[PDB]
């Protein structure tokens, strides 16, 4: 399978709005978990949301959410009530749940608030 697509490459959105990304796959794997990543100024990576959702998993904020589109290949990484703090670079990635796990991550898309 091919790496996913994180669009749009640049999303400029006014403060306190609904900013929504799109993580699209050409072909899906049988078992996989999709992750939403954000790069911190410390050159770190933070996992904000994950599909499928695990309500018991700590650290998840109610603002950032991932939504599976009806076609099952495309996803919606939306944030509600966007803050100027949210300005940064984002990316999506999938990890297969097969024995030999393969990492397939998108390119980076910047968010501006």
């Amino acid at each position: 399978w091919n790496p996913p697509t994180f669009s749009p490459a640049l999303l400029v959105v006014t403060e306190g709005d609904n900013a929504t990304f799109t993580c699209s796959f050409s072909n899906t794997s049988e078992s996989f978990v999709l992750n939403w990543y954000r790069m911190s100024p410390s050159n770190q990576t933070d996992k904000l949301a994950a599909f499928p959702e695990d309500r018991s998993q700590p650290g998840q904020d109610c603002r950032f959410r991932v939504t599976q589109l009806p076609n099952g290949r495309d996803f919606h990484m939306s944030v509600v009530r966007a803050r100027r703090n949210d300005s940064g670079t984002y990316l999506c990635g999938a990890i297969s749940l097969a024995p030999k796990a393969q990492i397939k991550e998108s390119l980076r898309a910047e968010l501006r608030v």
Partner: antibody
Amino acid sequence: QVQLVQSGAEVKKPGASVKVSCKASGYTFTSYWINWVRQAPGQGLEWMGNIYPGSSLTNYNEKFKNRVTMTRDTSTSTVYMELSSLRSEDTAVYYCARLSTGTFAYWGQGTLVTVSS
Amino acid sequence: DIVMTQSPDSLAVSLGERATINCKSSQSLWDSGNQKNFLTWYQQKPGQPPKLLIYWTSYRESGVPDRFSGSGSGTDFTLTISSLQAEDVAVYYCQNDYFYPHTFGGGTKVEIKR
């Protein structure tokens, strides 16, 4: 919630063998790697092995050449760890953990195995 | 076999300053198939199961605070706490997550200097 409950503490004699259970719940049990890590009193952690419940693939540590044995039971969603030819040095708390790379890490509460005459 | 050496063995930092722990591996932990450095950092308080802090050298697990930050590439790696709080006193282990066996480092005790 995701939970890993391990079997209770056990005391064994030198030369015996212990079998520690680890019951997974709250996720697709057969799809995630389950690790075994032990910690002797006053010493760091030591990786012991891997098991993939989907096909019972195992990755043992070379330190326990033929002493360690990992198995699974899909009907009860439990993984078992067996260590034979026990020594006093094998006295430790043994942990099971769901550690599939890139996914969230969960841990059992631990199991104390005392090896002493 | 991968050998993980952690230096210093023990570290004393005042409350609120920066702590740095080093971890050197005998072989490279780089994976060309995933473009990642497979190194994990763990935190363990006495009487508690270990807690995963950083995976893939510089990826933060959900719930890990801001102060924890991983870095390095190849055979040299580093875990840094920018603002050492009281709740950070624990032993920190680096672990080879790349090739089998997934050997641990000796650990580094982090205590509050007073």
